[PDB]
Amino acid sequence: ATAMLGTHVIWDFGLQSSVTLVIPWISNTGLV
Amino acid sequence: FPTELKPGTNQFLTTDDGVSAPILPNFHPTPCIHIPGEVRNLLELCQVETILEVNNVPTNATSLMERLRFPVSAQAGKGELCAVFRADPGRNGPWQSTLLGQLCGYYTQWSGSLEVTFMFTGSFMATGKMLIAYTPPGGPLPKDRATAMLGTHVIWDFGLQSSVTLVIPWISNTGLVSIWYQTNYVVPIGAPNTAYIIALAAAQKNFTMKLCKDA
Amino acid sequence: FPTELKPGTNQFLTTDDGVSAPILPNFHPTPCIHIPGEVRNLLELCQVETILEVNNVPTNATSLMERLRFPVSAQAGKGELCAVFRADPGRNGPWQSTLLGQLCGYYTQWSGSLEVTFMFTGSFMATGKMLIAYTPPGGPLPKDRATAMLGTHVIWDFGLQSSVTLVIPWISNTGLVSIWYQTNYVVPIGAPNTAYIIALAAAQKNFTMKLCKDA
Amino acid sequence: SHSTAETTLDSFFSRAGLVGEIDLPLKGTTNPNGYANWDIDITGYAQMRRKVELFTYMRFDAEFTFVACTPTGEVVPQLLQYMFVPPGAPKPDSRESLAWQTATNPSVFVKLSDPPAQVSVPFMSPASAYQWFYDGNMMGTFSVRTVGTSKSKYPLVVRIYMRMKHVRAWIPRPMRNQNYLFKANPNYAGNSIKPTGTSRTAITTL
C-alpha cells in the first residue's frame, strides 16, 4: 500500500510478457 | 350579479383538482439545482432488464440466492425438457422478482410486447445446443422436442454465443416458454460438468398501463 | 349563472390577503409631506456598524459601560492571547449588543459575509503590534501565536494605523476570532500604561434572511 | 442566498394578530350592561410595541376582523352591532344612549352564525404620520353590544384581529433594552438595569 503511493506500475502476465521501467537520473541511489 | 347554487355545492371529492389558499405568502422556496437521473414516466423503469426467477423452487433462507439461476448438466440426455414458465408479468410466479411485475401490480390493465434474455455462465471450453420455444395463447405445452421444433423457436449455441434474446409478440392484462436439450453437454477433461443460466426480462416501447390501483 | 362552493369557503385564514369594505367612504386622508430618512428594507439597517461587546464579563449596574471595550496593557508579554470570540450573530453572546443580532433574532435562517473593525484609543506616543486571526468552521482554537500565524491573519500596528478591518468570508444560520500580542506595549515616559480597543461589527451586501419569527 | 423580499417593510408587518378581547358575561360585574367600548390601539398584540418602536414615524391602514362565540366555543342565534366612533365624537355610556343611532358612526349588523365580519379603516391622523415618540395617535373606538332591548340569553366573547397594510417608516432607532413600565412612557426601573445579553467568566475562554 505504501509502495502504491509513489512511482509504480501494474504488470499483467496475461496481457503482456514484458514491461519497462525508466530511472529518471543517477549520479557517480534509488531502489526498485 | 344574480347567481344560483347547484347540487354539487358543499362537497369534498378527493380526486378533485383545484387551487387553495397559500398558508405562507411572502415565502420563497429554495431554488432547484441540477441532479442527474430524473424520471418523468414509469415506462422508462418498465423498459429496464431485471433478473427473472424461473427457478422459484427453494424457500430456505440460506438457499434463497439459488432462485436466480437454473442448471444445465452433463447427466441429461438429448431432447429432454429443461424448464418451462409462463409469460404473465402481473400474475403470481416467476415474474414477481422483476420490476415490471412489481410496477404493473400498481395498475389494472396493460398490453404490449416483452423480451427475455438468457445468458450462459459456464466455462470457455464447454459446448452444446439448446432449443427455446414460444407457444401462443390457447395452445398446450409441446410433448417433445420435435413438436416444439414445429413452431416459433431458436437454436442456441454455447460455443458461438453467450447470450440469446427472444421476443414475445403480444400479451394482455398467456403464452409459454420452454427450454429443451438439443444436444448433450460437451466438456473436455478438467472442466466442471455443470453450468448455470441467468434470465433477464424487460418490456418494449409499445407497452402501456391504465387505471392505477393500490396493491 | 351557476356556481359551486368549495371546501375552503367560510374560513378565516390570518395570513390571507384580500380587500375589505371601507368603513368611511368619502373621507380623504392627509397628503404625505417629504420626511428625510425613509427605510424600505431591513438590510439597510443590517449593514450599519454597531458596537460589539467582546468583554461581556461584568454585570454590575455601575460597571455596565466597561463591556464596550477591552484592555491592552504593558504588563503582558509577547505571544500571549488577548481575547477570543465566535462569529455567530444570531446566538447568545457578544453579538447580542449589535443591531444585526437583534434583527436576525426576528428570523429563522440567514447567510452571508460579515466585517469587524477594531479601533485603538491609546495615546499618540504608544506603539506595538497585534495579530488578529480567523479560524474557519470546524477547526479548533490555535494553541499559540506561531500556529495562528499559519492561517488567515493580519498584523496591526498602533503607530501606523488606528483602525483595522477583518472580513469573515461566509456564515450560515461557526468560526473564531482571536487577538494575540505580537510585540509588547511600548510607551515613553509620561504616557499611560494601558489602553482600550473598541470593536464594531456589520454585514456585507450579500447578507439575507428568511422565514420571519416572533422573538 | 435567499430573497430580499422577505425583509421589506410589508413583510415585517404583514399578518393579522389578536389585539383585543371583549367579555360580555351573563352575570357578574365585568360588563354589567351588554356593551363595551374598546379604543383602537396596536399594542394589544404583545410583540408589536418593540417592533414598531424601531422607527419614529409610521403610516399605514388597518383591517379588522371580529370573531365571536360562547366561552365554551359554541355558536348561538344572536345579533350584534359593532359601531365605529371616529376621533372627535361622543361615545356611548348606556344601552339607551342616543349615540347608537347616530348615522355618522358606521355600524355593522351581523349574526353569530355568520363568517367573521371585516372592515377597513384609513389613515386618520391630522399630521402626515403617526409618531411613537413626542418630545413635548387617536384612531377611533369600536363599541360592541347585542342588538335588542332586553338582555341576551347567552354569554359572549368577542376577539378582534388587526392587519396593517401600506406601511411606510422613517428614522430608525435603537431597539428596546429594558422592561416596560407604563404605556406611552419610556420609563424604566432604575434600581435594576440588566445587560443587553448573556455573560461569560473570562474574555479568553469561549
Place this chain on the structure above:
Amino acid sequence: SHSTAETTLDSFFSRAGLVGEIDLPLKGTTNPNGYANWDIDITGYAQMRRKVELFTYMRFDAEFTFVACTPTGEVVPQLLQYMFVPPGAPKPDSRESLAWQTATNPSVFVKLSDPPAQVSVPFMSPASAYQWFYDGNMMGTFSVRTVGTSKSKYPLVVRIYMRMKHVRAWIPRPMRNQNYLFKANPNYAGNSIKPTGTSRTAITTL
C-alpha cells in the same frame, strides 16, 4: 394501446388520502386537554412509503383538508383553530400557552357546520429536495384545538387528508421486499427472510 399519460409522476401521486386522525374525547386520558399536535408526515397513509421509496430524491407541494365531526358522525355548533407551526418554532404545551397567539404561526378559524377547510403548504426544505435515504425532512406541525376558555361540550374527531402536487423525482431504487420494523429505518427481521413471490414444486411443471 393505452395512453402514456396514466404513468406520469403526476398520476402516480395524484389523490388525497387520509394521513392523520386526531381524537378529542370528552373524558378519558387520550388528549385530556382539548388540543393536540400532529407532525406533518406522508407515511400516515399506509401505502405511501413503498411508493415514495422507489426514488431517492423528491420535491413537491402539499394540500391539506380537515374534516371534523362527532364519533357518531353528527354535526354540532363548535369552533376550532388549526394552527400551523413552521419548522424551527416552539409548539404549544398547554391550552393557555402563548404559542396560540403568535402572529407568525398561521391559523384558520372555522366552524363544524362548514365545508372542510383547505390550505396549501409549499416546499420547505433547506436543500433542493427531500431524501428518504441519508447515509450519515421536517415540514411543520398542525395544532388542533377548540376555541374558548372552558372545555367543549361535545366529543370531536378530526381527519386530515393530503394531496401532493408538482412532483419531481430522481434516481430510482429497488422496491421494498420485507416487512418494515421502524420509522426512518431500513431495518428488517433477519431471522425470517421471505422470497419476493410465490413458489412451485418443480421447474418443469407449470
Place this chain on the structure above:
Amino acid sequence: NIIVGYGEWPSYVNRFYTLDTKLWEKSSKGWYWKFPDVLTETGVFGQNAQFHYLYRSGFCIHVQCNASKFHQGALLVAVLPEYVIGGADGFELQHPYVLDAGIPISQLTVCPHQWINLRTNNCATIIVPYINALPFDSALNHCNFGLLVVPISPLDYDQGATPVIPITITLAPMCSEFA
C-alpha cells in the same frame, strides 16, 4: 470630516453661537442638549423664537476639544430626533448605558454620528435638516432632536498633566423660517 444627516441638506440670526465649555473628567458620564431649547434666550434667534407662532430651521454643529499628545480617550457624538427622556448649559447622563431612555448605547451609531479619538482627530461636524411630521411647529412647546456627547473610552493621563479637557460646541442656524 463633515457628515450630512440622512443625505439631505437644509432647505426652505444666521451666525455662529459658541456655547459655554464643558470639562471632561476621568469620571464623566456624558452630556446632552435639546434643540431649539438650547437657543431660546440667546440673541436675535432667541428673541425671534419667543415672539413668533410658527418656526422651522436646520442646523450646523461643530464639536471641538483640545488636548495634548499624552492624553487618551474617545467620544461619540450623535443626533437623535425626538429624544424623550425616561437650557444653554445642558444636562448630564445618569445611566449612560441605557441612554437614560431604556435603549442601548451600542446601537446609537444608527443615527448621524461622529467619532472623536484623541490620538487621531479633535473635531466633528454634523449638518441636520428639519425633521417633523408637520411643515411648521412651535419653538417653545416641542424639541425636535437632541445632541449627545458620551465618552466610550475613559480619559487617562499621567499625574502632572492637565486633569480636565475642554469640549466646545459652536452652532449656526441654516435656512431658518419664522411666521
Place this chain on the structure above:
Amino acid sequence: NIIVGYGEWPSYVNRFYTLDTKLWEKSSKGWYWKFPDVLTETGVFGQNAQFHYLYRSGFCIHVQCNASKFHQGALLVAVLPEYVIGGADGFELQHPYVLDAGIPISQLTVCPHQWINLRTNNCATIIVPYINALPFDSALNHCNFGLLVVPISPLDYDQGATPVIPITITLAPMCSEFA
C-alpha cells in the same frame, strides 16, 4: 465496455489508487465499499479530505479479475447512491438476497451496473458523477454512494486448479474540488 452513470460526465490527487486484492471463493457472498470513505487515509486525497470543510468530486472505477479458461462464474458490479445498511478493505454481505437493506438483488440492474462473465470478459468500468441535494458536502460525515460486487453465479473449478480468484479495484478521482 465503459458505462457512464445516468448519461452525465463529471464536471465542476487525480491519479490511480489501486486497492488491496479480494479473494473470490466457492462460498463467497459479496463485498461492498463506501465513498469517499474508501479514500480518506490514503495519500494526498485523504489528507485533503480531512482538512477541508467542503468537498465535491466524481469518480472512475475499474474492476478486474484474472482467471483461467477452466474457471466459471459471474459477478454483478453496481453503484447505489445513499446505500443505507439495515475503510479501504471493504465489508462483506451477510444476506446478499436482500442486499443487507430489505431490497431485492434481482432489481439492482436499475442502477449503473456491469456484468463480469468469466467466459466472456474480465473487466468493468463505471464513471460516476457527483450526486447530492447540495452543491457541496462534508467528506467525513456523509457517504455519497456505495459500490457492490456480488457473485450471481458461483465460482466452480476442478480439483487441482487454483481455488481462489483475485479481484482488483483501481479508481481515480475526477473533477475533485475542495473548500
